[PDB]
């Protein structure tokens, strides 16, 4: 019921450790969010689960860099440990490879192979179960976090060229890629549902497959489109 139309893109298995990179060019407008992260479906849910989730997100306002975050603790009672990375060039005026790698004993955030974040124990050894590797695009009703929300800037766009998975195992084997020529069904899930905080419907309506790239896309409600031209990775 809400007015703006957002998207998700996540992997339909969930995984217990790995290394995930993806190749993309982030969107980005005061309000909004585009991101890259590994999440336990369900830790929404307030029955006394714990909630485990590693974040990688873009807030809009600061197109320059990221905010890294493990979330655990519980629904409703979260830990937290936001901290930010310099991006250059800026994360929505280039395409970067985004990584994520965890274990039983760290997490580790890498823009192009580099380190910009590595924490080991407390949250990370409650990082337990399995989590499945998620992208989304979408603007915060929290104008202190990113921005008041700036509608004139709509369509926005996230893109994605490729993705990688590893297995924990350096530590990690490579399980398998996707170039993105195509939406593989079999892999992947389009989100359709939203949350509180969010301003935007997240649907399946704005995940597109547009030569060889996964594109997510931020619009006003009623008029989820995108017919421009892919940007050039090279
Ligand atoms: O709100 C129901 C919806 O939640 C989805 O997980 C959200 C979660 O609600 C939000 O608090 C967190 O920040 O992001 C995750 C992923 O977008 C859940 O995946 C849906 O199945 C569920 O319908
Ligand atoms: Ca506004
Ligand atoms: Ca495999
Ligand atoms: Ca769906
Ligand atoms: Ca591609």
């Given at each position: 019921?809400?007015?703006?139309?957002?998207?998700?893109?996540?992997?339909?298995?969930?995984?217990?450790?790995?290394?995930?990179?993806?190749?993309?060019?982030?969107?980005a407008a005061?309000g909004t969010?585009?991101?890259?992260?590994?999440?336990?479906?369900?830790?929404?849910?307030?029955?006394?689960?714990?909630?485990?989730?590693?974040?990688?997100?873009?807030?809009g306002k600061?197109?320059?860099?990221?905010?890294?975050?493990?979330?655990?603790?519980?629904?409703?009672?979260?830990?937290?440990?936001?901290?930010?990375?310099?991006?250059?060039?800026?994360?929505?005026?280039?395409?970067?490879?985004?990584?994520?790698?965890?274990?039983?004993?760290?997490?580790?955030?890498?823009?192009?192979?580099?380190?910009?974040?590595?924490?080991?124990?407390?949250?990370?050894?409650?990082?337990?179960?399995?989590?499945?590797?998620?992208?989304?695009?979408?603007?915060?009703?929290?104008?202190?976090?990113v921005?008041?929300?700036?509608?004139?800037?709509?369509?926005?766009?996230?893109?994605?060229?490729?993705?990688?998975?590893?297995?924990?195992?350096?530590?990690?084997?490579?399980?398998?890629?996707?170039?993105?020529?195509?939406?593989?069904?079999?892999?992947?899930?389009?989100?359709?549902?939203?949350?509180?905080?969010?301003?935007?419907?997240?649907?399946?309506?704005?995940?597109?497959?547009?030569?060889?790239?996964?594109?997510?896309?931020?619009?006003?409600?009623?008029?989820?489109?995108?017919?421009?031209?892919?940007?050039?990775?090279?």
């Open positions: 019921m809400k007015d703006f139309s957002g998207a998700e893109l996540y992997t339909l298995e969930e995984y217990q450790y790995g290394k995930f990179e993806a190749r993309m060019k982030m969107a005061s969010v585009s991101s890259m992260f590994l999440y336990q479906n369900g830790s929404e849910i307030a029955d006394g689960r714990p909630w485990v989730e590693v974040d990688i997100e873009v807030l600061s197109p320059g860099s990221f905010q890294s975050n493990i979330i655990t603790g519980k629904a409703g009672a979260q830990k937290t440990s936001e901290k930010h990375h310099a991006v250059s060039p800026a994360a929505d005026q280039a395409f970067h490879t985004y990584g994520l790698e965890w274990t039983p004993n760290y997490v580790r955030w890498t823009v192009d192979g580099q380190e910009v974040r590595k924490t080991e124990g407390g949250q990370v050894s409650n990082l337990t179960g399995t989590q499945g590797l998620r992208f989304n695009l979408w603007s915060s009703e929290s104008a202190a976090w921005g008041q929300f700036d509608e004139s800037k709509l369509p926005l766009f996230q893109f994605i060229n490729w993705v990688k998975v590893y297995k924990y195992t350096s530590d990690f084997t490579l399980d398998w890629t996707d170039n993105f020529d195509t939406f593989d069904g079999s892999r992947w899930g389009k989100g359709d549902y939203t949350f509180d905080g969010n301003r935007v419907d997240l649907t399946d309506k704005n995940i597109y497959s547009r030569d060889g790239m996964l594109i997510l896309a931020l619009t006003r409600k009623g008029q989820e489109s995108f017919n421009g031209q892919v940007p050039r990775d090279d």
